[PDB]
Ligand binder design. Structure first.
Ligand SMILES: NC(=O)c1ccc[n+]([C@@H]2O[C@H](COP(=O)([O-])OP(=O)(O)OC[C@H]3O[C@@H](n4cnc5c(N)ncnc54)[C@H](O)[C@@H]3O)[C@@H](O)[C@H]2O)c1
Ligand SMILES: NC(=O)c1ccc[n+]([C@@H]2O[C@H](COP(=O)([O-])OP(=O)(O)OC[C@H]3O[C@@H](n4cnc5c(N)ncnc54)[C@H](O)[C@@H]3O)[C@@H](O)[C@H]2O)c1
Ligand SMILES: NC(=O)c1ccc[n+]([C@@H]2O[C@H](COP(=O)([O-])OP(=O)(O)OC[C@H]3O[C@@H](n4cnc5c(N)ncnc54)[C@H](O)[C@@H]3O)[C@@H](O)[C@H]2O)c1
Ligand SMILES: NC(=O)c1ccc[n+]([C@@H]2O[C@H](COP(=O)([O-])OP(=O)(O)OC[C@H]3O[C@@H](n4cnc5c(N)ncnc54)[C@H](O)[C@@H]3O)[C@@H](O)[C@H]2O)c1
Ligand SMILES: OC[C@H]1O[C@@H](O)[C@H](O)[C@@H](O)[C@@H]1O
Ligand SMILES: OC[C@H]1O[C@@H](O)[C@H](O)[C@@H](O)[C@@H]1O
Ligand SMILES: OC[C@H]1O[C@@H](O)[C@H](O)[C@@H](O)[C@@H]1O
Ligand SMILES: OC[C@H]1O[C@@H](O)[C@H](O)[C@@H](O)[C@@H]1O
Ligand SMILES: O=[N+]([O-])c1ccc(F)c(O)c1
Ligand SMILES: O=[N+]([O-])c1ccc(F)c(O)c1
Ligand SMILES: O=[N+]([O-])c1ccc(F)c(O)c1
Ligand SMILES: O=[N+]([O-])c1ccc(F)c(O)c1
Ligand code: NA
Ligand code: NA
Ligand code: NA
Ligand code: NA
Lengths: 256, 256, 256, 256
């Protein structure tokens, strides 16, 4: 009952972190709209979870997003929280292997889709004194190798979260982000499968955390439910869900 | 039931933020040991809350703290979480008005008391795969005027939290801190009463946050219960509970 | 002679911070290519400074940038440092007053122009073991009101700086950024002139810093010359040139 | 001539980073007072460098420090910059192997010695509009394993730098810190010699940086001369001299 009577939209909620967030909010008592560009996972999740429904929506298509918001209000009568989770990490790319156009396309998903849904949702979030939760990444803060466009998009999301928090504070609408580190998801598994030694790639990812394991979608979901339901004095924060990967010295490569 | 069956020690739990944390953990189903050097508030809290008991303990006295831990284990059989909240903010002091000995005394409360309880508790936290929550302050991160010793003690607590998180990660013990901003507590009220215009001092403190109000002990308490019960992939983090005070430009004082 | 024999490109170098950086590098002994989309300031700077030449170049036009790099190599035989300073801050815009297309256009200047020049310059910077300096902004780190797109672009630049630093570290090429706060420039003056009370707007900007004044282009220039010439163990850093604006509590707007 | 006519005190200046800072300031044209508790290195440095003199001074002894300041003024007539570099890193210590009294002793050197010299110097720095530079450490910011007391002392120094910057800003006195990462110094070499495999310990320290090497005292010295002589709009900053050790993922230890 922590978030009972509330209505939540989760983008990219059909699998991975997004599905973990969907499950966490349903378990808290909320009704959840699962937005995803792929039907497979999200439609099955709707059948599985009574408090969840699936709406096909590509967050890069402004008309898809307009319909997502108007259908949410038409079907459920209010909107309390938007979780902007949809996003993609390309395979490793050296800087000279990137393109401006590929950079533009990744900005369209990771940044502008978050911007567009947030903009269309804010009039309703103001009425409900709701909140926005953006899923950024630890690598926006500390960088990552072979990922210049991806890192840039998440640096933008984290910064945008703080700007929006300032703008919406007089209306009682909080805007926060979660920065996960290595979370074991289908995207992580897909990316490891492209590596010469997938098992070695996965073990390296596990040992990047002092805790010695990757995180779970359910753990990101619990952080999201906290930010929505119990963090009434938090706005503009970056909640790290990383297992301590940012702590201490590690292998990143006597004084010349 | 979020933290049912667990045993929590809260230092400085007799009033203010500490009492808000005590209440939050009792509401989550935990048994709570209220530690405080003053009997008045903590003893009344024990009478009020069934899941809470009061143990008189000055965290600067190592033998008081040894007895706090051994009495907790004797009476409740386990220890799952230590919340190091005891601490003090002196009245405003210009740098030339501080002393090394006053600095040493503030380090004894704000830093070494946290260190001592954590050290004595860790053998039991390892057995329970428990966790440590230190109450630091936003001003450890961003500074504050007329508070050189206080700011230094909280910078130490936040850093120490990260070091300890690294050391205890192989044992499954998480170590995190909460950095509150302006929280309306008896200490805040006492400090404002020393000012020429207390009402103006309080209004200034309220407007230091984009949210336009100070925070509540219950809001710090909810963050603590989150870190203890649902943040299993968080260690070494600094959870800001500040109402956005660190965001954007403000009045802190054309190019010469 | 701190940077004698070296060749530096400064984008947006015709006025403001960029011109201050141009002057600082000329004073250090470097030859400087002034890139700007406007002829007026940059052409006069070339006439004024013996070690500087002006090349008309719009950093959003990839063919302009290709020609900028090839002309620099043709005329001076090497390239040691690229300072990505070109960028724009729109007038204050409430979130609901922004557009995706306006956001895209600002990303094109503030982020992708920096990306494009850096990409085209890196083969030559590798040969010279040169370095990249991006001019970001403090508001990428802490947020700003009525500037969601601008803040997002600078969050991206700061993050991208760290990603690129990781990628180029094995080649000995350092990548750093400077985050200025309020610097008194023609852009600042233009923006204040749009306000109801320009003088009040300027005084507010001055008092946003504990130092009680805004910064100078020459001060950003000195930081850039430091990063280029004497910071051989710095890569991926964010050098704050802000007068302390990020420090302490301020006016950003008792516990409800 | 960048800092000609100025007078600088460097504590712990007899070897290591401190000696590199002494050399950098002498090369900039300043007169330097070398403070150290050991005579060997500092006395030889005075003989070697015309613009430098050695004063025996233990920064934990308040009367030593009073005499250091009064002798500096008596001999040179002004004081422009204090570099608080004296400090120590103990050998690796597990948390349960530390003591409160050992923690107190390390606070006395790393934190209170910096506090005491700064306090005694500030009246003269106000007259000269001088500045303070504290040598902290990257591990104050990100933590380190087996170093709870050391990490806590450097977290305190970095925070104290920001508090003091706020307090002294109305007097035109800037207060900044440098946070080095792995710098190859006699302390680093001594600590590695205690390890089972010193060569393996040194190689691990080198590879903790994306640049693949440790830093040099001269590189910390150049950062200090920058902060003193050319960073007039920087106060309360933490200048990282770390070779990028804080960037990206590394080895710090699939989802359980
Ligand atoms: N997995 C990690 O380690 C990790 C770490 C940090 C941040 N993140 C972020 O978390 C989020 C989710 O990552 P994940 O690992 O769960 O990925 P994932 O690929 O497993 O799942 C992403 C989901 O989003 C959907 N999606 C993609 N593009 C979409 C679009 N245009 N419109 C609507 N839905 C779309 C996909 O169909 C999928 O269901 C992303 O923003 C990612 O950047 C992930
Ligand atoms: N109030 C704020 O705005 C604020 C902001 C940031 C951080 N904090 C921190 O939160 C904590 C609590 O602050 P507060 O405002 O609730 O203060 P408070 O003075 O209202 O309550 C502190 C409690 O700790 C107890 N205590 C003090 N010294 C003790 C000792 N030696 N041993 C045991 N108990 C002791 C006091 O008796 C009291 O019950 C402190 O660590 C403080 O630095 C407060
Ligand atoms: N002024 C401040 O307070 C401040 C603070 C933080 C960051 N910054 C950043 O510093 C940089 C310079 O700011 P400023 O105040 O000097 O601005 P400015 O407007 O005074 O000068 C910017 C210069 O860049 C040029 N320019 C603009 N678009 C260009 C393009 N497409 N191609 C080439 N040149 C182009 C302009 O013609 C001008 O000469 C920007 O990146 C800005 O975001 C400024
Ligand atoms: N070496 C590194 O990798 C590294 C990294 C980050 C920070 N630091 C910091 O840099 C500073 C210097 O470190 P280092 O590696 O050069 O150490 P070092 O041991 O090589 O040199 C320190 C110097 O300070 C002197 N000193 C020690 N205690 C003193 C006291 N009480 N009074 C006066 N002088 C005293 C010593 O005699 C010595 O000459 C310290 O503050 C250290 O914490 C070092
Ligand atoms: O595909 C890798 C992992 O992705 C997560 O989203 C799922 O919850 C797991 O079942 C799966 O092991
Ligand atoms: O004393 C100021 C405030 O302190 C808080 O700890 C209490 O919960 C409030 O009742 C009180 O208004
Ligand atoms: O236009 C405001 C300021 O802009 C700076 O770039 C110039 O150096 C100054 O001459 C001018 O006062
Ligand atoms: O002792 C290790 C290193 O310490 C530095 O301070 C010295 O400048 C070097 O000569 C030496 O290699
Ligand atoms: O830190 N990240 O953002 C991140 C890490 C690993 C992944 F596989 C991923 O898709 C995203
Ligand atoms: O930010 N703080 O740590 C803080 C702020 C105000 C107070 F009254 C106080 O006691 C502590
Ligand atoms: O912090 N900035 O990025 C910033 C501040 C003020 C300006 F006028 C400006 O053009 C940019
Ligand atoms: O990061 N440090 O503070 C640090 C690292 C290595 C050392 F040997 C040392 O004495 C200090
Ligand atoms: Na359903
Ligand atoms: Na009770
Ligand atoms: Na010229
Ligand atoms: Na000499």
């Amino acid at each position: 009952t922590r978030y009972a009577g509330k209505v939540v939209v989760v983008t990219g909620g059909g699998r991975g972190i997004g599905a973990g967030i969907v499950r966490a909010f349903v378990n808290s008592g909320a009704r959840v709209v699962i937005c995803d560009k792929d039907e497979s996972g999200g439609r099955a999740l709707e059948q599985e979870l009574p408090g969840a429904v699936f709406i096909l929506c590509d967050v890069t298509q402004e008309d898809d997003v307009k319909t997502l918001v108007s259908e949410t209000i038409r079907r459920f009568g209010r909107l309390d929280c938007v979780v902007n989770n949809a996003g993609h990490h390309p395979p490793p790319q050296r800087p000279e292997e990137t393109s401006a156009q590929g950079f533009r396309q990744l900005l369209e998903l990771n940044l502008l889709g978050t911007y567009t849904l947030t903009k269309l949702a804010l009039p309703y979030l103001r009425k409900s004194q709701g909140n926005v939760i953006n899923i950024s990444s630890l690598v926006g803060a500390i960088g990552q190798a072979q990922a210049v466009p991806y890192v840039a998009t998440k640096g933008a999301v984290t910064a945008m979260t703080k700007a929006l928090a300032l703008d919406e504070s007089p209306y009682g609408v909080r805007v926060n982000c979660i920065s996960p580190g290595n979370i074991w998801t289908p995207l992580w598994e897909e990316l490891a499968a492209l590596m010469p030694d997938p098992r070695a790639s996965i073990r390296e990812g596990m040992l990047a955390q002092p805790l010695g394991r990757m995180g779970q979608p359910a753990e990101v979901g619990a952080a999201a439910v906290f930010l929505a339901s119990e963090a009434n004095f938090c706005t503009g924060i970056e909640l790290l869900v990383t297992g301590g990967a940012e702590l201490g010295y590690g292998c990143k490569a006597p004084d010349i």
